[PDB]
Scaffold this active site. Structure first.
Site, mmCIF file in Angstrom:
data_model
loop_
_atom_site.group_PDB
_atom_site.id
_atom_site.type_symbol
_atom_site.label_atom_id
_atom_site.label_comp_id
_atom_site.label_asym_id
_atom_site.label_seq_id
_atom_site.Cartn_x
_atom_site.Cartn_y
_atom_site.Cartn_z
ATOM 1 N N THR A 72 0.797 -1.227 0.000
ATOM 2 C CA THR A 72 0.000 0.000 0.000
ATOM 3 C C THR A 72 0.827 1.272 0.000
ATOM 4 O O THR A 72 0.643 2.134 -0.851
ATOM 5 C CB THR A 72 -0.941 -0.015 1.207
ATOM 6 O OG1 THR A 72 -1.714 -1.206 1.114
ATOM 7 C CG2 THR A 72 -1.834 1.130 1.208
ATOM 8 N N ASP A 124 -4.456 0.858 -5.566
ATOM 9 C CA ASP A 124 -3.024 0.749 -5.275
ATOM 10 C C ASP A 124 -2.404 -0.573 -5.743
ATOM 11 O O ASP A 124 -1.260 -0.581 -6.187
ATOM 12 C CB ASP A 124 -2.727 1.047 -3.781
ATOM 13 C CG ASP A 124 -3.543 0.215 -2.818
ATOM 14 O OD1 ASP A 124 -4.322 -0.667 -3.215
ATOM 15 O OD2 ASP A 124 -3.398 0.522 -1.613
ATOM 16 N N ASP A 129 25.616 -1.299 -15.735
ATOM 17 C CA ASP A 129 24.996 -0.648 -14.569
ATOM 18 C C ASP A 129 25.542 -1.236 -13.282
ATOM 19 O O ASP A 129 24.834 -1.862 -12.445
ATOM 20 C CB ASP A 129 23.474 -0.772 -14.635
ATOM 21 C CG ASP A 129 22.777 0.117 -13.616
ATOM 22 O OD1 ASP A 129 23.397 1.126 -13.161
ATOM 23 O OD2 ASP A 129 21.611 -0.187 -13.277
HETATM 24 CA CA CA Z 1 24.535 3.111 -13.414
HETATM 25 ZN ZN ZN Z 2 -3.434 -5.102 2.240
#
Ligand code: CA
Ligand code: ZN
Ligand SMILES: *[C@@H]1O[C@H](CO)[C@@H](O[C@@H]2O[C@H](CO)[C@@H](O[C@@H]3O[C@H](CO[C@H]4O[C@H](CO)[C@@H](O)[C@H](O[C@H]5O[C@H](CO)[C@@H](O)[C@H](O)[C@@H]5O[C@H]5O[C@H](CO)[C@@H](O)[C@H](O)[C@@H]5O)[C@@H]4O)[C@@H](O)[C@H](O[C@H]4O[C@H](CO)[C@@H](O)[C@H](O)[C@@H]4O[C@H]4O[C@H](CO)[C@@H](O)[C@H](O)[C@@H]4O)[C@@H]3O)[C@H](O)[C@H]2NC(C)=O)[C@H](O)[C@H]1NC(C)=O
Ligand code: Y8Z
Ligand code: NA
Ligand code: NA
Length: 806
Positions: free
Chosen positions: A159, A308, A683
């Site tokens: 949530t 949500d 990365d």
């Molecule tokens: Ca990076």
């Molecule tokens: Zn919940």
């Protein structure tokens, strides 16, 4: 301390917050135990309930009543929401035919259509169809406005991370709210659902919509309500605020419902007990819409109905226990449930080792219902690593399951039947989006999209400039009738060089060999043409990618593929090729197995060398354009150029080779040709963004050849698959992946089996948006199409999820 001796007289649901110790009268005062002594009496009236009845019509105003049915209530802005229905012969909003809202029909004094965001916790996408019979108000919003079949939440599908992502446009790793429970090791402080630490502003990063609005002079209702304030009173408060004078009235408002989540945890997502909470939420929607109609605002306000996350069936008996794997279970702290996060119990214990914990958790039981990851190895589409509050060790739990540390945690903390938090591509976790009002389109269905996109649209709805965020502004323009945001394409920063033949073979001392000394004015002119780009229109279908940072790179043309070759990283940034439905796969000929060829367009000093690979006992190499897909035996020699070579661990080569040899042709067959762009990603700091040269942590031994952390491919074809990819007249179709470049296949428990039983499954887990690859590479794709730029932005945010029908 709070001096609760002050009074809420004429201050009920005040918008500005008063600082301690003066007592509060705002919608959160209960949560701080700080309301004035008379807040309940004055501000939480309940007498006579929430609905007018025939006998109350025309009543003498009694200020004690929860809401009013007196003749003066409209001018006071405090009628019960059904007043005009019961007392003035009007219809409920839900009973009215829908009629297109072509222009805002607002009362005088309204400077802009207000926005009301109606958020529902735990509202699973499939409730919109499965519950439609018992939700007529919501069904009317959905059918008459703009709706998606579902909206994708962020990971973890909890949530607090999702509501705060809705409010900010940011991934949890960037806004800081990475779970409902967190420990921050810099603060040395813990955040939990219960308690006061969670109100401290230090946890909350980015800039949520209500602050965006306030900073740009647009007033906001307060977005948070104490749980004990009943929904009917929340609605009446919003309607009261909407009757404030012009200079005092907010333009944006939020309502939040704890249902259907609350019941869904108790009863499961489709428990028979779930019909009543759905009915109750629909009734609240109907109160709001009736109230807006009373205020003549029902064709003025934009309403967003949004969830949500969804809700899955989860029961106590489906729990994996770390005590069945780890010898040292009391040396760790676990954040448990539908995701696991592990760290050391004590920072003073120097016998703590993440590698031994990962190993003890990896493929240990045949049906194992979670998988461990170092966070940097989680699928890049989760964007769940770049925050000190995210523990290095992560457990991805299978849908329908929990993880816990020991059995005693689960019974001495079955109750519950539902839960959420799983991978955000899981069908049960998908949630809802409907927009209704003058700024949204009429009776329009839009494709599924990610909740990180909505902040930009909410800013558009309010005439606000959004703070920097992770949405791609303009990708949701197709939801809107007006207020679209018309972005321009980013400018290319680095222009390519186009090298011709500039080096003789003997200038190279790369330690490579090839059996290519096998010897025509017909074909010689033709091969020159190919090297100058004569086949480029077939292989570079959407223009060359633009390089959006400063670097030195060369465009290299070939019969079967084109590439942008980095002189800094010694390999292509991208390699582009088209494979028709009719393409044939061939083998690498015996005499070419170990062939690598110097590229006479590229200096020895800007080339890889074969000796580095010979001497690096852990590292091998692969090719970006696959020799298996060469158009002819002669063209095949181009695929063995040193400029098409990239460093690959042997274990990764199993994955890559299967992709190139088997899958690309499979996709071309199924999609009526494909265009492929492939390349490396670096990365090392797991921030989702292209590494600079000084961030590279690993090189091929003894060399300056950097090792990629991932390899990507973008696979594009015609949406109308009756047209071949290279002759497509309309919208495109894309799928992409970012595969982790790992020295083992420990992620794949079935990797001892033939690639046909595990490789595609790995690729699916690492599905990506084109936009994810753009962030990771500094490249901008689809620069030259026939398509509108907003449509291309929507294509770049597409994620192919491989889940079946919702
Ligand atoms: Ca990076
Ligand atoms: Zn919940
Ligand atoms: C999703 O979208 C978001 C938003 O666009 C993208 O995030 C941005 O990315 C940028 C690069 O990572 C980053 O820019 C940096 O800003 C630094 C100043 O940051 C503060 O100010 C801003 C503005 O108000 C604020 O938003 C920041 O908020 C972060 O930090 C607080 C905690 O202090 C948190 O509450 C908040 O949640 C947020 O945390 C997140 O981001 C930070 C990074 O800022 C992470 O550490 C967290 O884990 C979390 O993810 C800050 O309050 C600025 O100092 C940086 O400048 C460095 O580099 C530049 C190069 O341009 C150079 O000029 C300087 O030398 C400098 O280097 C120096 O510091 C180094 C490290 O300390 C040191 O090694 C050097 O030697 C130097 O001393 C940098 O420009 C920007 O802050 C964020 N914004 C947000 C909101 O997160 C995100 O990338 C998108 N994601 C994807 C995948 O696309
Ligand atoms: C006892 N209370 C409950 O059991 C349910 N509950 C609902 C209220 N509440 C919140 O709203 C939190 C969640 C993340 C952020 N909210 C949005 O970020 C947000 C809120 C509303 C809306 Cl409508 C939107 C959005 F973007 F969708 F519009 C975002 C604040 C906390 C309590 C809280 C309020 C303020 C700060 C810290 C905690 C919560 O515990
Ligand atoms: Na090697
Ligand atoms: Na394996």
């Amino acid at each position: 301390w709070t001096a609760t001796s002050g009074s809420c007289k004429g201050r009920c649901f005040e918008l500005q917050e008063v600082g301690p110790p003066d007592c509060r009268c705002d919608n959160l005062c209960k949560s701080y135990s700080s309301c004035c002594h008379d807040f309940d009496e004055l501000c939480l009236k309940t007498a006579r309930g929430w609905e007018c009845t025939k006998d109350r019509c025309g009543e003498v105003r009694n200020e004690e009543n929860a809401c009013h049915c007196s003749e003066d209530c409209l001018s006071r802005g405090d009628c019960c929401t059904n007043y005009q229905v019961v007392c003035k012969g009007e219809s409920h909003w839900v009973d009215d035919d829908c009629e297109e809202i072509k222009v805002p029909e607002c009362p005088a004094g309204f400077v802009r259509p207000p926005l009301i965001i109606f958020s529902v916790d735990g509202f699973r996408a499939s409730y919109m169809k499965k519950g439609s019979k018992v939700m007529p108000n919501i069904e009317k919003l959905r059918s008459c406005g703009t709706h998606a079949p579902y909206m994708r939440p962020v990971y973890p599908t909890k949530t607090f991370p999702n509501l705060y992502t809705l409010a900010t446009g940011l991934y949890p790793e960037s806004h800081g709210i990475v779970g409902n429970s967190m420990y921050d090791p810099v603060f040395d402080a813990s955040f939990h659902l219960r308690g006061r630490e969670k109100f401290n502003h230090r946890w909350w990063g980015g800039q949520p919509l209500w602050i965006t609005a306030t900073k740009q002079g647009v007033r906001a209702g307060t977005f948070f309500w104490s749980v004990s304030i009943p929904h009917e009173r929340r609605i009446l408060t919003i309607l009261q605020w909407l009757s404030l004078p012009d200079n005092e009235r907010p333009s944006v408002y939020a309502f939040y419902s704890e249902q259907p989540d609350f019941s869904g945890h108790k009863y499961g997502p489709f428990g028979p007990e779930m019909t009543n909470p759905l009915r109750e939420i629909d009734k609240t929607v109907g109160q709001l819409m009736d109230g807006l109609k009373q205020l003549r605002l029902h064709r003025c306000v934009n309403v967003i109905f949004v969830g949500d996350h969804g809700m899955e069936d989860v029961t106590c008996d489906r729990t994996e226990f770390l005590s069945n794997y780890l010898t040292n279970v009391d040396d760790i702290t676990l954040v448990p449930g539908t995701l696991g996060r592990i760290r050391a119990k004590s920072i003073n214990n120097s016998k703590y080792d993440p590698k031994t914990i990962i190993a003890a958790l990896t493929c240990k039981k045949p049906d194992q219902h979670f998988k461990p990851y170092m966070k940097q190895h989680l699928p890049k589409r989760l964007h769940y690593a770049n925050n000190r509050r995210i523990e290095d060790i992560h457990l991805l739990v299978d849908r329908r399951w929990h993880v816990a540390r020991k059995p005693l945690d689960v019974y001495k903390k079955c109750f519950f039947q539902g839960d959420h938090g799983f991978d955000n591509k899981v069908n049960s976790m998908q949630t809802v989006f409907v927009g209704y009002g003058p700024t949204f389109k009429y009776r329009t269905k839009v494709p599924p999209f990610e909740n990180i996109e909505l902040y930009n649209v909410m800013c558009d709805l309010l005439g606000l400039k959004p703070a920097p965020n992770n949405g791609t502004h303009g990708s949701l323009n197709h939801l809107l009738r007006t207020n679209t945001f018309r972005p321009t394409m980013p400018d290319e920063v680095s222009r390519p060089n186009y090298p011709g033949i500039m080096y003789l073979q003997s200038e190279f001392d790369l330690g490579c060999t090839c059996d290519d000394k096998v010897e025509n004015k017909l074909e010689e002119l033709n091969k020159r043409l190919h090297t100058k780009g004569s086949t480029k229109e077939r292989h570079l279908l959407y223009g060359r990618p633009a390089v959006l940072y400063r670097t030195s790179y060369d465009i290299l043309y070939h019969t079967d593929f084109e590439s942008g070759y980095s002189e800094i990283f010694l390999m292509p940034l991208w390699t582009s090729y088209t494979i028709s439905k009719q393409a044939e796969v061939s083998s690498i000929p015996e005499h070419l197995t170990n062939c690598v060829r110097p590229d006479v367009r590229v200096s020895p000093g800007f080339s890889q060398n074969c000796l580095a690979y010979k001497n690096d006992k852990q590292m091998s190499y692969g090719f970006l354009f696959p020799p298996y897909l060469s158009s002819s035996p002669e063209a095949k020699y181009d695929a063995f150029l040193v400029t098409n070579m990239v460093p690959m661990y042997p274990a990764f080569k199993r994955v890559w080779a299967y992709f190139q040899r088997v899958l690309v042709k499979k996709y071309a067959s199924e999609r009526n040709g494909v265009n492929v762009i492939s390349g490396p990603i670096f990365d090392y700091n797991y921030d989702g963004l292209r590494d600079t040269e000084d961030e590279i942590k690993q090189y091929v031994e003894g060399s300056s050849i950097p090792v990629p952390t991932h390899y990507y491919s973008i696979i594009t074809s015609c949406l109308d698959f009756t047209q071949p990819a290279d002759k497509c007249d309309g919208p495109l179709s894309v799928s992409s992946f970012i595969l982790p470049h790992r020295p083992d296949n420990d992620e794949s428990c079935n990797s001892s089996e033939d690639e046909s039983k595990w490789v595609e499954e790995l690729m699916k887990m690492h599905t990506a948006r084109v936009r994810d690859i753009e962030h990771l590479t500094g490249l901008d794709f689809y620069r030259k199409t026939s398509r509108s730029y907003s449509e291309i932005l929507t294509l770049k945010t597409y994620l192919h999820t491989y889940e079946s029908e919702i």
